Structure formats: structure tokens, C-alpha cells
């Protein structure tokens, strides 16, 4: 998806003059749109590697 | 104007003169003594908290050896790992002895260090080729690597151990090393098969046998007895003569 | 005794230079970012004179 | 400065610049204070190990109480000989010290009586625990337990007492995590 | 002053052994912008490039080997060798301190009462690809006849060729005694 | 030193048959003054300039093609 | 009830896996305590064990009480940072209560052979 | 003590390379310290706390990184380290950058004693002048009975060694090297066994890098520093 | 901690034998089990058949031991040595150690009576 976002804007720049303030509104909402799931990607940590064996962080209590 | 070029030749400058170098003759032991008379009153509170396992203790030139039998081990390293005066939370090393002469061969020697009192102290058990010893991992996980080691040279089968394999000889090595009738080139040797196109286990031939010089041992005793250094503390008392 | 011993000067050696020795240096950092935002400003200033004047280029055309 | 460093480059036993090239070499360096380390040639292993003047006047060195000729006998300096034997102690040794004394505080009766009581000892009499709930308060606080009545710590040879070394006498600033321990 | 209980002056903390704090982004010397900066141009980074640029215009240390050797000093030990008097005569007198302190049993001696009635060897072998070049045969000798030579240009092709007989360390020491004359020299006072 | 001027003024220094010869057979270009020759042939140079750094100041011109 | 032995997060002293305790003095107090109940009811009063670790309990729990400062009382127990000596009042409470399953005031249990404890001393075996 | 005695302008040379070895450090330094990548690649990957470090057996820069101040030239000084002023790094977080400041820090102080030994070189012997240990000077070997006697015993029986056993350590630059020896009052040892620092950390390998990624790995093998003829011995 | 292998197994010294019967006979079923994994790892050039007649052979080796303490070493070693074996630890070499009978025959002359040995030496 995201090479289709930076493709599809391939027009846009060989466009660029005939779509003179029109096609510039157009093509930021674009962007606008397609970085809003940019930020859920980034939120969500979907490129991020878990680590299964954690390191212990549970204090250590005695019953008396 | 300094640099490198107008630099001071070190190689001129006058060196230290001495005409007669002065080194006083001291015996290295005497260092030691009130050291060793405090091991010995820490020794001695150890046998009374302990008098069901340590069997004696011993003491030469700040090092402390406790002495005592294989069911004593787990409970005697509690007490150096746990007890407040003796904190020995680090293991140093675990090892065996051979003494073909002892019903008893081997001698399993533990070394403990405590990094909160800057001391060291020994704990010694014995073993047989057939009878166990208690495993300290429980304790110390340290300990795993070298106990695997001790069964690997000398055969010490530790009691408890997760994994005991061997750790330093080939992988179907039939023979412990380090054991005093093991020969020091061992029983076999191996070479590339060219019929088999493997490596091969074969008997062993030497081109040149192995040379002793052991039979060059001195006939006269080296070293006579050596100097009592126990404190009046720890000799028993003469009765006075009437 | 001791005649031909290698031994040390009679006022030792010159100190040596065993402290770290990693100076600070360099403009303080906004200097560099006001630097790299003339540079690119003046770049723009200078590109987009030039898309106009190809712009009325391509009027003649 | 600090007693170590920095140095200047002209104080440095190596092979640097001359002329313009060392007014530009400082101008360039993120150190001028740094150094190429060729080591100057004609001071440095120079003259060879192989034709030094010194291996001609060079002779055995020695201190004075051991290479004297007149009043130093062997057995006055054989430490070897001098070991320190290294003691044993089973528990019949330790009663002994408990139930009897010392030689440094005796409690032991005189002539025979004493012998045969050190007899009893030798052989299975009188037992470790016997002699350890046979023992009065003053033997145990002070010569089992302290005289205050605490047990003993694990003796060190060398005391160190360590001091921490901190802000410009450092070996690193104040940021990183690592510490200076005189 | 103090009695102690399980413990010790020593063992005792230094004054100020609980480290302070660890410092938040806030309670900071240096604002987001500057820092960001650092963040974004890479500036260790560029200073660590420069870094090695500065060795890019200093003298190489390499030297070209089979024409410019390295240092050797009259201490090293290199190949064997047993050496002669100025008479000629070998200086080896078939003691076997060489053969017995060496830690490799790579000497292998034999001898006999010569013809004319001298102590002096029949056989004397060393197996390089045994001998670990310690020189504690170069230490033991009381003659100086077994010495290591400085060099180490002999490897061969073959490991028949580095079963040292008595012949190739004697023609070995008639090659190398100058330089093992100038080696003397210069080391035989240290030991 | 690593620069051109050396290989310049060394190679102006020691003519152009020793530089062809250095340059198939050390690779590099070294003046020096002749210190002996060895009873095989093989001829032992010393330098003094500035620019050869410490281990670099004595060299050999084998006498065979097949050095060694 | 239960004690608060180490802090595994938070704010770090010098050691790794150490983390600053909240409310020290009361955790040291417990387990003194508690170690003292142990002893005083199962095990024999004339036991040098006993006696050792009552009258060094007794020793840091005074220093302890008479004490408010941290660091005052780290200074005084020569042994670590307090955070350590929680830890150490734990491991001496856990050996006691081991050792009460143990018996070492017993007699000695498995008695040496006479060939076991000898080496290369004894003038003429070599 | 020493085989031979230092050859003739050896100390010059060494402050030689001690004046200029400081700023090979530093360029060192400038590559690795501060950089991101390497911190990266070393800050909280093989950690280990203080307490595991001890029950693990680890000592020296792995031992110090996690907190612990304790080196045996300061806590049992065994040659001169104790006529002679050093200072010893330890570090919090028990990360692989600690251990690295850590050996960085103990080039320098290093450095440091070694100007000092070269300012302070005494006069006098290298080795112990009792020749029933050690061997005589060949110009007394070769004109006095005695001597020559005592090279013949020491180089071809040995000097024989008191009975007994020690353990005995140093403050080897992987660690705690240490050896327990036996001697049976004869010239050839009973026991001899080396207690390596490596094995006692490639045995802590398991728990150290258990949670990592396979690049960590690298960094962790790397920071033990490990030398296998010491882990086999 | 450090946690233990694949197929390891704690050292528990037996104090019966009908117990170690057991732990032996288990032992023998995993020998068994794991033959086909022999012959596929190590590149045997012969039968699972053989495989486990082998693993038979050595079992009877210490059929008629008595002694409760040889047989808990011998099967502490025979448990090291199936963790060695299937755990691909070993390799061939060490592997068909075991085997010598599946190599070719060696040589003519292998003698059986006194003569034989005599005129080459082994009497
Ligand atoms: C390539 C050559 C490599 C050189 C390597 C040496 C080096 O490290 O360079 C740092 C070197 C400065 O290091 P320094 O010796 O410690 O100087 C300390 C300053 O005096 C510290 O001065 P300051 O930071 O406190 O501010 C003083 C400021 C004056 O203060 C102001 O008036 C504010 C100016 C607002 C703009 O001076 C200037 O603004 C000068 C004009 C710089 C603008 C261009 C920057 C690029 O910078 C240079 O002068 C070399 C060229 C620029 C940096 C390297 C090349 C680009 C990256
Ligand atoms: C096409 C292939 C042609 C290759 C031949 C090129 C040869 C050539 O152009 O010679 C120019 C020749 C190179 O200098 P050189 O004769 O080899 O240096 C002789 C001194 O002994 C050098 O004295 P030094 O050993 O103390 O070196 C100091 C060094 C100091 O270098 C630095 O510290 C600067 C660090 C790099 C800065 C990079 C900024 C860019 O400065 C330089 O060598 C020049 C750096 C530029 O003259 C020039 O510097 C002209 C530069 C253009
Ligand atoms: C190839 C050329 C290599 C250039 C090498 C010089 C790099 C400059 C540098 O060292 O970074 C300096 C940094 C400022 O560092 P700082 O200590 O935080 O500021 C106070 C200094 N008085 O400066 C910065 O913070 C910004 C980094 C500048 C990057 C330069 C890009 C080229
Ligand atoms: C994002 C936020 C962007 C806002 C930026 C605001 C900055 C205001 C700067 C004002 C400078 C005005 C100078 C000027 O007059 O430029 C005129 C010049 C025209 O060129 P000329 O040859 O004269 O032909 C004109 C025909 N009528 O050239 C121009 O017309 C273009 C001037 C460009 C000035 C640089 C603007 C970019 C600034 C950096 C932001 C982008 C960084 C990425
Ligand atoms: C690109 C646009 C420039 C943005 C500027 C910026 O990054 O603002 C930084 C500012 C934090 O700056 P601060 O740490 O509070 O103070 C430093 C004073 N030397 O950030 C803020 O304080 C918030 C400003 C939001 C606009
Ligand atoms: C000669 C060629 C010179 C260039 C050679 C560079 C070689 C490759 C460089 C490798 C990149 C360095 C790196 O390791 O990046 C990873 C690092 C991760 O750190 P992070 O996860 O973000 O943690 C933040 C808390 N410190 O995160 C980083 O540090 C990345 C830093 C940014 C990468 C450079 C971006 C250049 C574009 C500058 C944009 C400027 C505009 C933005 C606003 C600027 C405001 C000042
Ligand atoms: S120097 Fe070589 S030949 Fe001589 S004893 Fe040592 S290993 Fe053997
Ligand atoms: S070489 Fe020297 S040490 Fe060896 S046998 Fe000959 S004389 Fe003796």
C-alpha cells in the first residue's frame, strides 16, 4: 500500500502545473488521509519484535 | 619554536646510581600470623555452630579448609551462603582429587569467596567412583559447568545435577583423565581412512614413547619438617609437671 | 651490587597523558540549523526564480 | 591542569609536522594535542639491543645481607625450610581446647592428673557437644563467640576501606554510567 | 569506637556509593531544539568520520617484509643450533640437561666415549614440531653448545625435513655463529 | 611518508633503472646509501630522511629474480 | 503477614537488580524479629548457633530502632546499604528456619575414616 | 620472580609509547563512545544484576559493571600493586557499555602504573638469590662448585616444593584467574587445576542471553571476552 | 537460571533395583525409538535392524551386574550417551565406534589358536 500511495503521486508531479491549486488541495487531503493510517501503524507497534522471556520486575516478598 | 625535532633526548638525562642495593631477609609466613589465629577463632565458631557436620577444619597462610562428609554439603553451604558473619556468595571453583590410596578416592574441594568481607574459605568432601555427591546448583548456579567438569576428568557423579554430560573430552570418550591410573596418552587415536574415507579410532602407537624422568627423583628428603606457626590459643596445654 | 642496571632518571620522566582528551568542539548546535536553514532557504529562493523564468520560457514556446 | 593530562604534542616521543603543514594540521585536528605515532627514529631503539654499551660493564646484581661473604649462613635465610606446617583439627583437638584450656590460658589440673585428663580426651570420654553445654558463659564469650557475644566475621588479611572519586578528578564525566574507586 | 555485628569498617558503603538519581527530561541542561539538532545531523557520527579521515593523511606503518624485516632482538628464539669452539671442536658434551628440562621431550640424545677418549655425542635430534622454541635448552646448556638462532625463515615443504638431526644443527651453528657470536655478546651478562 | 614528492625526489635520487627495478621488486621507491653487499650478492641499504618511518630505515636489493 | 524484601524497579542504587526500598527500618524490625521467634522457639537455648544469631539480630536491631538516618545505620551495621542488609536479615531468617529442620547442634553424624584427612606429612610414607 | 633482567633502555622506550599511547585511546574513543550504534548495540543487552553475577561465579569487568567494587590488587595485593596508585571503574546497569567504559578506564589507569614503574624501577635482583630455587649466574656456574651443583639439580630434578595446597588468585584482565595446587613434597606437581574466568561466564551464557536476539548474542560473547584456551584448558 | 537440554534427565541414584529396572527398561525403549533418528542423522550405511541389535548387545554387556551403585553409573552413562546420539552432538566418527563389525574385513590373517599368534607374535 504505501508504494501505491508514493506511485499514485507520480501523476500527480508530472500534473503538477495543469492542477494549478485544485489537484494541490486534492492530493494533501490524500496524504492527509493515507498518513492518518500511517499513525495507526505507528501506534499500534505493528513492525515491532516482542521478546517472550522477559526480565522479572516482581518484588520479592516474604510472608511472615 | 618546540617540537618534535628540538625534542629532549631522554636517553642522556643522569640515571638512578646505587652502590650497594639493601634488602632485608624476612620469612613470607610471618606475615600471616595474626591472620591465621583469626581464621583459626572463626574456624572454631564454625565446628560449634555446626559440630553435626564439619568434621575438623585446617589452616596454612590465610586459607581455611572445612572438612566434612558428602551428606554435609548442602546444609554447610547454606550456612556460607546465607549466615550474616560468613557471606560466601561467590563460587570460585569446584574440583577433585585423587587419593587412590584413601577408601575414599576422591576428594571433592569447593572454593567460596565473599566479596562483602574480602575473605575465601574451602569446604572438602569425599567420593567414591561409584558413590555420589550432592549438587550445590541449588545453591549456586556457578556450579553446574563444574561439577560437569569433575565427572568429565575424574568421574564424580554429582547427585541432583539438571544436565551432567561431559564438558571437555570427545564426544564418546570411555575414560576419566585425570584419574592416576588413566596413562597421560590415554588408550586411543585417530587418523583419516582413506579406504573408509572417515575418521578413525584406532589402539595407540607412538613413534617416540613417552619419557618419564620421574625415576630422576631425589633420593636425600628435600624438606625436613616444617615451623609449628599455630597460636598458644589452639595447642593444648602441658600439664605443668607437679 | 648494581653497575650497569637499566633504572630511571634522577627526576623521573615528564608526565604522561592518561586522561580522557576528547575535547568539545564545534559550533553550538542552532548555529548549524540556522546555517542549514539559510542554505536551504537560499536554495529555494534560487529554484523557484528559475521555474518561473522557465515557466515564461515555455510561453515564448 | 590535573596530574594526568593533557600533554602537548611537542612533549610526545613522535614524528609529527614542520612548516605549513603543521599550521595546518592544528587547524584541522578536532585535537591538536593528538599525535601520529611513528616513533621518532633516531631516539627509539636506539642504539640497538644487540650493541648497547651497557652489556660490557653490566654485572650480576645482589643485596647486601645475602651476598655477604663473612656472617651469612644458609640456615639463617632458608625460608623454604622454615615452612609453616599446616595444622589439623578434629573435633577431639577442639574439646580438648574446650573442656581443658590452652597453653595461652590453661584449665588443666597438674602432673598425671592432667595427663590421663587429656587422655580422656584423645580417646572418646568426653564429646564436643558435652564439652559445649559443659561450658561456662565466659569460655564461650571469648574463645567460641567474642567478648561481646557476637560470633566472628570472616577475617580479611588486607583491609581495604574504599573511597570514591568524584566530579574533575574523575575518569568520566558525570553523565555515564560508569564510576572512579580509589 | 564500634562494635561490629557481621559486618565491617570496611565492609561498610562509601559515603557516596547510592548513586543520585537518575535525571528526567525535564531538570535538563540543554533545550529540545539543541539536542534535536544532534539528533538529526549526526554529529558524533561526523566527528568519528573526521576522525578516521585524519588517519587517511598519516604515515602508514606497514613495512614491506622480504625486504625490510622487523625487530629482532638478541634474545630471540628462533632456530637450533650447536655450536663449536674456536678449535673447532664441538662444545657439547653429552650431559642431557637439555634433553631433560625440556618441557616438549623434543631432544633426543645418545653418546658414547669417542675414539679419543672424549665425552661427545652419537645421536642428537630435535623434532621442531614438537619443540615450543623456550629456550630453557639454551638456559641449561654449561657450555653454550645448543642456542636458538635468530631466524625463522626455514619453513619446508615436508615434516621429514624438521627432524633436526646432529649434521644439519651442526652445519646450522657453522651458518648462523656470527649472528648468534653477535647475540652472545650483547646477552650473555644477563644470564 | 605515503606521498608522491618522496617517490619524486628518491626516484631523481636513485636513477630510472634502480626505480624500475625497485618497482618490480619492492614495489616502492627507497633511496639510501649503500651499506655492503653479502657473500651471495645481495646488496643492504640504509636511509636517513625524515619521511621513513621506524622500521624502515634498512633494506635489501636481492641479487636473484626468485628472492627469498 | 508479609514483608517487603527487594525492590526489583523503581529507582536504582549503585547495584543492578537493587532498587531503593520504601520504609526500610519496619521490614529489618519484622524479620529481626521473626529470625528471634524462630530461634527462642525451636531451638536449644545453650546452641552456640542460637546465641550467635540472637545476640547479632539484637545488635542490628538496636541500631536499627535507636537510628533513623539510612545512611547512619549503614555506617553502623558495617555491612553494605540497607537494602543489602534487608536482604542479608532475609537469608539469615530462611537459614534458620532450614536449620531448625536440621538438628547441627547434634553430634557429628558421619564420623571420618582414619585413612580420610591425611596428606603428605606424616615423615614416612614417601 | 623473573628469568632475566630488563636490557638496556627498555624504560625510555616504554615511556616512549607511553606518551603517545593516550591518544590512541581517545581516537578509539571518539569512533565507539559516544556513538549511536554502539550504543545501541550495548546498552541493556547482556545485563546481569550483581546478585546473579556472584551465584554465577563472574568476576572482574562482568563482576564490576553490575555494582560490585572488587578487584584483588586492591582487596589482596599480591606483587606491587599496592606501592602504587590506581584507581578501579565500576558501573551501574550491568550492560555490555559498562564493561566496555570499564576496560577503557582500566587502559588508562594501566597507563598510569605503568609510568609510575618506569619513574620507580628499584635496584637489586629479579629473581630470588637462593640458588636451591633458583638458578645461578652462568659466571658463577661456571667457576663455583656450589652453583653449578644447584643448575645441575634445578635443571634436571627440580626444586622440590613443601607439602601442602593453595589456591591463590590474581586480577587477570579476563578476571579472576586462579590455581589450585597440590604439592606431594616432590619436584612435579599432584594437582594442578586452573580456575579460568571464561568458563565461569560461557557457563553463564544461558541465563545472560536467554530473552536476546541472535545479534546480542555477538555483543555478549564479545563483552565475556573469551579466550577458549582458557575455557578447555 | 540454567536450564538443562533436550533430553536430559537429573542423576537420581536408585535406592532399589526393581526402580532402575525401570528407568533401564525405559532407557532400552528409547534406544529402541530412536534408532530410525540414528540412521537418518548419522549417514549409516546399514541396517535399523543393525542399529538396534547393537543397542541389544550392549544392554546384555551388564545384564548379570549386581552391584545397585555400577548399574545407577551405567545407567547414568547410558542416558549421557542417548542425549549425545540423538541430540545431533556426535558425529559419525564417534558414532560408528560402536560398529566395527560393519567394516570391512581387515586383512587375512586373524588368529584363533596358538600357533598363529606365535608366529606373529601375540602369544
Ligand atoms: C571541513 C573542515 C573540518 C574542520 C574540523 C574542525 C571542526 O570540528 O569544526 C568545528 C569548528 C568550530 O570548532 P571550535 O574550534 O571549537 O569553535 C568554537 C566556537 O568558537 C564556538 O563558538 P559559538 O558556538 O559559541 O558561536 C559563535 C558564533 C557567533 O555567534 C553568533 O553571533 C550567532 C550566529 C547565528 C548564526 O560564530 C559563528 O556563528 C560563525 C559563523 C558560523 C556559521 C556557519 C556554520 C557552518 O567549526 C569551524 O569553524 C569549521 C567549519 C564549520 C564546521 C565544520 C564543517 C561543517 C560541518
Ligand atoms: C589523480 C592521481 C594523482 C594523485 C597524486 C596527488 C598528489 C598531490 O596532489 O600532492 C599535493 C601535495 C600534498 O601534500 P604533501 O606533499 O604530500 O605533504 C607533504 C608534507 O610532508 C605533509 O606533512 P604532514 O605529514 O604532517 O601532513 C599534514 C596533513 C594534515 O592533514 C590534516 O590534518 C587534515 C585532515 C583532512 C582534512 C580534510 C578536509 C577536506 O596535511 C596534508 O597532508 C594535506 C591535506 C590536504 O600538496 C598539497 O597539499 C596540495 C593539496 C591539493
Ligand atoms: C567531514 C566533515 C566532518 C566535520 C566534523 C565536525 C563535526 C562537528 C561536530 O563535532 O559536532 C559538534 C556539534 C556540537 O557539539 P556540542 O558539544 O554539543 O556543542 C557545544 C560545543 N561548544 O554540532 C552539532 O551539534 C550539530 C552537528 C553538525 C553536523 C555537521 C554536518 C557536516
Ligand atoms: C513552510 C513555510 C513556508 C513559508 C516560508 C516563508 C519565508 C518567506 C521568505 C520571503 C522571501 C521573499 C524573497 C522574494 O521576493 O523572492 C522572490 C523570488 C522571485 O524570483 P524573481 O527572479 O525575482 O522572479 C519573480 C517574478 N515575479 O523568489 C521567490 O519567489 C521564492 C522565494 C523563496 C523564499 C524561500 C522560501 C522557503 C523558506 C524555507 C521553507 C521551506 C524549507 C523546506
Ligand atoms: C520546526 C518548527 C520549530 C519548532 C521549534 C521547537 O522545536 O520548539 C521547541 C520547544 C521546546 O523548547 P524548550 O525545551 O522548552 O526550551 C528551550 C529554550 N532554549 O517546544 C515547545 O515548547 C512547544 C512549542 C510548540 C509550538
Ligand atoms: C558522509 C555521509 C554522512 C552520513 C553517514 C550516515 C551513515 C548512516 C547513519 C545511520 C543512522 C544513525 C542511527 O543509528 O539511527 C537510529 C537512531 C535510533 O534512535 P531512536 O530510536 O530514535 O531513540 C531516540 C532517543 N535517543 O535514530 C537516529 O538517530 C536517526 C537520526 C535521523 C537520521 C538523519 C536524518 C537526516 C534528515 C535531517 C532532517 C532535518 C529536518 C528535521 C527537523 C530538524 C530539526 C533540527
Ligand atoms: S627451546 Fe625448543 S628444543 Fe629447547 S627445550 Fe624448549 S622446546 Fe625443547
Ligand atoms: S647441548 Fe649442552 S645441555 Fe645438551 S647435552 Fe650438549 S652440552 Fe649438555
Same mark, same amino acid.
Not at chain 2, 70 to 80: G, K, N
Given at each position: 500500500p504505501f508504494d501505491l500511495e508514493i506511485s499514485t503521486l507520480l501523476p500527480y508531479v508530472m500534473s503538477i502545473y495543469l492542477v494549478s491549486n485544485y489537484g494541490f488541495t486534492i492530493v494533501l487531503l490524500f496524504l492527509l488521509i493515507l498518513i492518518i493510517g500511517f499513525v495507526y501503524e505507528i501506534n499500534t507497534n505493528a513492525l515491532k519484535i516482542n521478546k517472550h522471556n522477559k526480565p522479572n520486575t516482581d518484588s520479592l516478598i516474604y510472608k511472615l | 619554536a618546540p617540537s618534535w625535532e628540538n625534542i629532549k633526548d631522554i636517553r642522556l638525562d643522569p640515571k638512578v646510581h646505587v652502590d650497594e642495593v639493601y634488602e632485608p631477609i624476612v620469612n613470607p609466613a610471618d606475615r600471616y600470623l595474626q591472620h591465621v589465629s583469626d581464621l583459626h577463632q572463626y574456624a572454631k565458631y564454625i565446628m560449634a555452630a555446626l559440630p553435626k557436620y564439619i568434621q575438623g577444619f585446617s589452616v596454612w597462610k590465610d586459607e581455611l579448609t572445612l572438612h566434612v562428609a558428602?551428606?554435609?554439603?548442602?546444609?554447610?553451604?547454606?550456612?556460607?551462603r546465607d549466615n550474616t558473619s560468613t557471606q560466601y556468595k561467590s563460587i570460585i571453583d569446584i574440583t577433585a582429587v585423587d587419593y587412590p590410596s584413601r577408601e575414599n578416592r576422591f576428594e571433592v574441594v569447593y572454593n567460596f569467596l565473599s566479596v562483602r568481607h574480602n575473605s575465601r574459605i574451602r569446604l572438602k568432601t569425599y567420593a567414591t567412583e561409584v558413590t555420589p555427591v550432592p549438587s550445590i546448583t541449588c545453591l549456586y548456579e556457578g556450579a553446574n559447568w563444574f561439577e560437569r567438569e569433575a565427572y568429565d576428568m575424574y568421574g564424580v557423579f554429582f547427585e541432583g545435577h539438571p544436565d551432567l554430560r561431559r564438558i571437555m573430552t570427545d564426544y564418546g570418550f570411555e575414560g576419566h583423565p585425570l584419574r592416576k591410573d588413566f596413562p597421560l596418552t590415554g588408550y586411543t587415536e585417530v587418523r583419516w581412512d582413506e579406504e573408509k574415507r572417515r575418521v578413525v579410532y584406532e589402539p595407540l602407537e607412538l613413534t617416540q614413547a613417552f619419557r618419564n624422568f620421574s625415576a630422576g627423583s631425589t633420593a636425600w628428603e628435600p624438606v625436613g619438617p616444617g615451623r609449628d606457626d599455630r597460636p598458644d590459643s589452639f595447642k593444648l596445654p602441658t600439664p605443668k609437671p607437679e | 651490587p648494581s653497575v650497569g642496571q637499566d633504572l630511571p632518571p634522577v627526576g623521573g620522566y615528564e608526565p604522561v597523558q592518561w586522561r580522557r582528551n576528547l575535547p568539545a568542539r564545534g559550533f553550538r548546535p542552532l548555529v548549524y540549523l540556522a546555517a542549514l536553514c539559510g542554505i536551504c532557504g537560499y536554495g529555494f529562493y534560487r529554484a523557484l526564480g528559475g521555474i518561473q523564468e522557465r515557466r515564461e520560457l515555455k510561453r515564448e514556446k | 591542569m590535573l596530574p594526568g593530562g593533557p600533554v602537548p $604534542?611537542?612533549?610526545?616521543?613522535? $614524528?609529527?609536522?614542520?612548516? /605549513?603543514?603543521?599550521?595546518?594540521? $592544528?587547524?584541522?585536528? /578536532?585535537?591538536?594535542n593528538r599525535s601520529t605515532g611513528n616513533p621518532i627514529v633516531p631516539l627509539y631503539r636506539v642504539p640497538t639491543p644487540g650493541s648497547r654499551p651497557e652489556a660490557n660493564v653490566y654485572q650480576d646484581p645482589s643485596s647486601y645481607p645475602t651476598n655477604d661473604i663473612a656472617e651469612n649462613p644458609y640456615w639463617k635465610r632458608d625460608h623454604r625450610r622454615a615452612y609453616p606446617q599446616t595444622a589439623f583439627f578434629d573435633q577431639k583437638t577442639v574439646t580438648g581446647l574446650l573442656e581443658l584450656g590452652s597453653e595461652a590460658t590453661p584449665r588443666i589440673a597438674d602432673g598425671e592428673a592432667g595427663t590421663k585428663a587429656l587422655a580422656n580426651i584423645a580417646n572418646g570420654g568426653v564429646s564436643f557437644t558435652q564439652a559445649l553445654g559443659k561450658s561456662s558463659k565466659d569460655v564461650i564469650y571469648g574463645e567460641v563467640l567474642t567478648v561481646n557475644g557476637l560470633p566472628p566475621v570472616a577475617p580479611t588479611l588486607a583491609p581495604k576501606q574504599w573511597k570514591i572519586i568524584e566530579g574533575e578528578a574523575a575518569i568520566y564525566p558525570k553523565g555515564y554510567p560508569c564510576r572512579t574507586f580509589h | 569506637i564500634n562494635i561490629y555485628a557481621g559486618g565491617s569498617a570496611a565492609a561498610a558503603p562509601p559515603a557516596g556509593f547510592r548513586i543520585h538519581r537518575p535525571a528526567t527530561w525535564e531538570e535538563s541542561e540543554e533545550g529540545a531544539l539543541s539536542k534535536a539538532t544532534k539528533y538529526f545531523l549526526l554529529?558524533?557520527?561526523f566527528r568519528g568520520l573526521y576522525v578516521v579521515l585524519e588517519q587517511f593523511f598519516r604515515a602508514p606503518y606497514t613495512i614491506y617484509y622480504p625486504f625490510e624485516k622487523g625487530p629482532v632482538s638478541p634474545r630471540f628464539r628462533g632456530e637450533h643450533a650447536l655450536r663449536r669452539y674456536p678449535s673447532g671442536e664441538e662444545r657439547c658434551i653429552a650431559c642431557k640437561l637439555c634433553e631433560a628440562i625440556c618441557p616438549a621431550l623434543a631432544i633426543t640424545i645418545d653418546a658414547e666415549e669417542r675414539i679419543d677418549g672424549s665425552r661427545r655425542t652419537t645421536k642428537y635430534d630435535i623434532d621442531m614440531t614438537k619443540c615450543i622454541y623456550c629456550g630453557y635448552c639454551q638456559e641449561s646448556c654449561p657450555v653454550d653448545a645448543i642456542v636458538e638462532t635468530p631466524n625463522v625463515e626455514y619453513a619446508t615443504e615436508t615434516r621429514e625435513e624438521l627432524?633436526?638431526?646432529?649434521?644439519? @644443527?651442526?652445519?646450522?651453528?657453522?651458518?648462523?655463529? @656470527?649472528?648468534?657470536?653477535?647475540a652472545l655478546d650483547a646477552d650473555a651478562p644477563y644470564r | 611518508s605515503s606521498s608522491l614528492y618522496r617517490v619524486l625526489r628518491n626516484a631523481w635520487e636513485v636513477g630510472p633503472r634502480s626505480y624500475w627495478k625497485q618497482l618490480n621488486s619492492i614495489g616502492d621507491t627507497k633511496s639510501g646509501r649503500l651499506v655492503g653487499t653479502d657473500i651471495y650478492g645481495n646488496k643492504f641499504y640504509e636511509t636517513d630522511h625524515q619521511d621513513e618511518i621506524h622500521l624502515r630505515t634498512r633494506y635489501v636489493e636481492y641479487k636473484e629474480k626468485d628472492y627469498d | 503477614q508479609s514483608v517487603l524484601v527487594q525492590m526489583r524497579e523503581g529507582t536504582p542504587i549503585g547495584l543492578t537488580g537493587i532498587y531503593q526500598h520504601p520504609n526500610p527500618r519496619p521490614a529489618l524490625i519484622a524479620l529481626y524479629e521473626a529470625t528471634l521467634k524462630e530461634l527462642q522457639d525451636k531451638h536449644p537455648k545453650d546452641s552456640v548457633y542460637r546465641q550467635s544469631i540472637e545476640n547479632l539480630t539484637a545488635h542490628r536491631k538496636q541500631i536499627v530502632e535507636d537510628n533513623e538516618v539510612s545512611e547512619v545505620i549503614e555506617n553502623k551495621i558495617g555491612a553494605g546499604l540497607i537494602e543489602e542488609v534487608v536482604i542479608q536479615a532475609h537469608?539469615?531468617?530462611?537459614?534458620?528456619?532450614?536449620?531448625?529442620?536440621?538438628?547441627?547442634w547434634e553430634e557429628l553424624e558421619e564420623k571420618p575414616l582414619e585413612d580420610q584427612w591425611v596428606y603428605f606429612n606424616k615423615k614416612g610414607v614417601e | 620472580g623473573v628469568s632475566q633482567d630488563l636490557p638496556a633502555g627498555l624504560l625510555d622506550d616504554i615511556y616512549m609509547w607511553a606518551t603517545q599511547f593516550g591518544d590512541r585511546l581517545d581516537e578509539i574513543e571518539e569512533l565507539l563512545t559516544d556513538n549511536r550504534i554502539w550504543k545501541l548495540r550495548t546498552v541493556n543487552i547482556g545485563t546481569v544484576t550483581a546478585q546473579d553475577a556472584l551465584n554465577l561465579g563472574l568476576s572482574g569487568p562482568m563482576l564490576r559493571g553490575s555494582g560490585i567494587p572488587f578487584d584483588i590488587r586492591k582487596n589482596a595485593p599480591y606483587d606491587a600493586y599496592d606501592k602504587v596508585d590506581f584507581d578501579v571503574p565500576v558501573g551501574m546497569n550491568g550492560d555490555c557499555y559498562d564493561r566496555y567504559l570499564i576496560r577503557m578506564a582500566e587502559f588508562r589507569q594501566s597507563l598510569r602504573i605503568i609510568e609510575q614503574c618506569?619513574?620507580?624501577?628499584?635496584?637489586?635482583?629479579?629473581?630470588?638469590?637462593d640458588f636451591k630455587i633458583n638458578s645461578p649466574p652462568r659466571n658463577l656456574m661456571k667457576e663455583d662448585m656450589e652453583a653449578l651443583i644447584h643448575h645441575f639439580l634445578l635443571y634436571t630434578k627440580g626444586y622440590s616444593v613443601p607439602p601442602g595446597e593453595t589456591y591463590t588468585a590474581i586480577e587477570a584482565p579476563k578476571g579472576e584467574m586462579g590455581?589450585?595446587?597440590?604439592?606431594?613434597g616432590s619436584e612435579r606437581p599432584y594437582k594442578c587445576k586452573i580456575r579460568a574466568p571464561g568458563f565461569a561466564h560461557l557457563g553463564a551464557f544461558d541465563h545472560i542471553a536467554r530473552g536476546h536476539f541472535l545479534p546480542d548474542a555477538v555483543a555478549i560473547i564479545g563483552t565475556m571476552d573469551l579466550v577458549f584456551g582458557e575455557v578447555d584448558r | 537460571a540454567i536450564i538443562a537440554t533436550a533430553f536430559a534427565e537429573t542423576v537420581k541414584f536408585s535406592g532399589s533395583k526393581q526402580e532402575l529396572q525401570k528407568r533401564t527398561l525405559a532407557?532400552?525403549?528409547?534406544?529402541?525409538?530412536? *534408532?530410525?533418528?540414528? *540412521?537418518?542423522?548419522?549417514?549409516?550405511?546399514?541396517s535399523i535392524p543393525t542399529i538396534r541389535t547393537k543397542i541389544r548387545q550392549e544392554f546384555e554387556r551388564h545384564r548379570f551386574v549386581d552391584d545397585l551403585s555400577i548399574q545407577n553409573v551405567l545407567y547414568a552413562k547410558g542416558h549421557m550417551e542417548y542425549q549425545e546420539c540423538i541430540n545431533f552432538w556426535k558425529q559419525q566418527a564417534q558414532f560408528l565406534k560402536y560398529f566395527p563389525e560393519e567394516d570391512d574385513i581387515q586383512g587375512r590373517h586373524q588368529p584363533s589358536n596358538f600357533v598363529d599368534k606365535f608366529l606373529k607374535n601375540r602369544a
Open positions: - | 558428602p551428606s554435609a554439603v548442602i546444609p554447610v553451604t547454606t550456612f556460607l | - | $604534542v611537542f612533549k610526545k616521543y613522535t $614524528v609529527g609536522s614542520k612548516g /605549513i603543514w603543521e599550521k595546518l594540521r $592544528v587547524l584541522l585536528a /578536532i585535537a591538536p | 554529529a558524533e557520527m627432524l633436526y638431526n646432529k649434521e644439519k @644443527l651442526l652445519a646450522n651453528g657453522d651458518k648462523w655463529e @656470527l649472528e648468534l657470536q653477535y | - | 537469608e539469615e531468617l530462611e537459614l534458620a528456619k532450614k536449620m531448625s529442620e536440621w538438628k547441627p | 618506569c619513574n620507580d624501577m628499584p635496584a637489586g635482583a629479579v629473581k630470588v638469590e590455581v589450585y595446587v597440590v604439592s606431594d | 532407557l532400552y525403549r528409547q534406544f529402541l525409538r530412536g *534408532a530410525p533418528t540414528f *540412521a537418518d542423522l548419522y549417514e549409516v550405511q546399514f
